[PDB]
């Protein structure tokens, strides 16, 4: 049990940042200094993470200008003597890892997008992070979920509780527990309304997912807000295999909103940067 | 004495921002929702530009992609009912106005910048706008130069004091008063050592500047840090013409550097947004 490859989903709409989005994703909106994508990516590669796939929407090249390498950038660099600057640009991705790039026909769910990506996964378990979900912890998170993944052969969710007024945004699981941090999903609904919603645990943007779920997703039909949900393939997948929830050591911040980017760089700016609010 | 034309120089490289500014400069940044070089180009609008000219480097995509149209989107948004951002992406380049692009070859400097712009300008007073300075004023900041150099027949630039530990980071102006507002350039000086600074008073980047200034370009060669600098250019058609310095009314944020930037989402988040840090 072997987990070398995570997805990107990075092809939604993101109109919740217009005017900001109207030429990049969101994904690649920054941080302080760095767009949410590198995070993400920096996680799954400290997770061991070597092929990166990103499934593209609009604005395709900002995400692969990105991650591409830039030498008349690095030539200019290396002139001038910004040599800090340069291995920084290099320490965007290190030389191991490989970029593929694949569209999604149309932005029909998460679920249609990882669909998408089966192609390049194959047959093998694969990693999801939803870069929107911006995760700041001493061990990444992705390395926590991979290892709770091997350990119990099966597929893993990142999950928090969260307030019963805000499941309208998450998928909530109804589990079980097997350990302190580790539970056995048994049902998982898509943005319930808070009423219904059977628990407050929710999925965060990290997933382990073994590739049974591609089968599931081609069945899979649309759900909230008329979308092919992900979360709709793995409550497919649960008939068939184990599925876990795992809460993550590490804090999350709600950069799909305006609010919780703006406490992400608040937060941030003030831990790694020294930016205190005047 | 009319002012129709402004130009954007959105060709540095914006290392200060690195890894964000890999693939879009650095005024594609956002302030909340709102890239800073809208910010700049809305101020122009109000202020009577009908005809802007973006001065464009490697990273053109981001820039390009912002203003011109988009119906993809367009057609999305108009099957999703929704009328209200459809009709503030239109906005984002207003009917009236028409937009430009020419390429700088390399990142020589600002003045440099602005030479390259000597074709689409031809021949008349024109504006220019710095967008990481993000000003905040009850009337168009450049509106306020534009009335001042049609009064007095002669080029203008944005002033406000600083304190003089800040000198090494503005042009600096050495000015004798012809009104309480506004004074009468005789010297510019790039980034001067606090010890050797003239004065306290800095230039914003808010220019009205008459064509006069394109030869001088063509003759000025590097100074401060290794680039063509637009203040050696004006130090020069100092002694030909007049230029004036005007205490605008407004509040600036110096959004070119990570710590201006910060305080400009801190404080414009809360006034305009009511985003609060947590
Ligand atoms: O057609 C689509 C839809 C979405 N995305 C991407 O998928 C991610 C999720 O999209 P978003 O609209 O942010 O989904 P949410 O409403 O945030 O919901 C998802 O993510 C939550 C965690 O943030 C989970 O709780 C939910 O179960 C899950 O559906 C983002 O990276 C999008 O860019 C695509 O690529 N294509
Ligand atoms: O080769 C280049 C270099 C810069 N720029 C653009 O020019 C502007 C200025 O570049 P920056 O490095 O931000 O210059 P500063 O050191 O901020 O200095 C300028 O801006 C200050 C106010 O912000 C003034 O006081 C200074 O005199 C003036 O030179 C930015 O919008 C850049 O995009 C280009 O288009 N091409
Ligand atoms: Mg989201
Ligand atoms: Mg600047």
Redesign the interface.
């Given at each position: 049990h072997v987990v070398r490859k995570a997805v990107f989903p990075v092809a939604g709409?993101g109109?919740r940042?217009?005017?900001?989005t109207?030429?990049?994703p969101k994904e690649?909106?920054?941080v302080?200094?760095?767009?949410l994508i590198?995070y993400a990516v920096e996680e799954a590669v400290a997770a061991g993470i070597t092929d990166l796939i990103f499934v593209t929407g609009?604005?395709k090249?900002?995400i692969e200008?990105?991650f591409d390498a830039?030498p008349?950038?690095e030539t200019?660099?290396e002139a001038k003597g910004?040599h800090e600057?340069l291995a920084?640009?290099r320490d965007?991705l290190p030389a191991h890892v490989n970029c593929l790039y694949i569209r999604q026909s149309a932005p029909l769910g998460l679920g249609h997008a990882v669909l998408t990506a089966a192609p390049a996964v194959g047959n093998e378990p694969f990693a999801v992070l939803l870069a929107d979900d911006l995760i700041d912890a001493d061990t990444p998170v992705l390395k926590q979920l991979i290892d709770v993944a091997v350990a119990r052969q099966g597929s893993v969710l990142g999950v928090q509780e969260v307030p019963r007024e805000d499941t309208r945004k998450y998928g909530i699981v109804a589990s079980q527990p097997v350990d302190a941090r580790t539970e056995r999903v048994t049902h998982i609904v898509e943005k319930p309304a808070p009423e219904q919603a059977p628990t407050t645990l929710a999925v965060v943007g990290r997933y382990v997912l073994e590739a049974a779920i591609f089968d599931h997703l081609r069945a899979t039909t649309v759900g909230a807000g008329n979308e092919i949900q992900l979360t709709d393939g793995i409550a497919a997948l649960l008939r068939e295999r184990d599925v876990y929830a795992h809460r993550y050591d590490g804090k999350r911040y709600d950069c799909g909103s305006?609010?919780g980017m703006?406490?992400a760089?608040?937060?941030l700016?003030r831990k790694y940067?020294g930016?205190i609010?005047?």
């Open positions: 709409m109109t940042f217009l005017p900001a109207k030429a990049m690649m909106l920054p302080v200094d760095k767009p590198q609009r604005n090249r900002a200008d990105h830039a008349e950038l200019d660099l910004k600057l920084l640009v965007i305006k609010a703006f406490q760089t608040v937060a700016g940067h930016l609010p005047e």
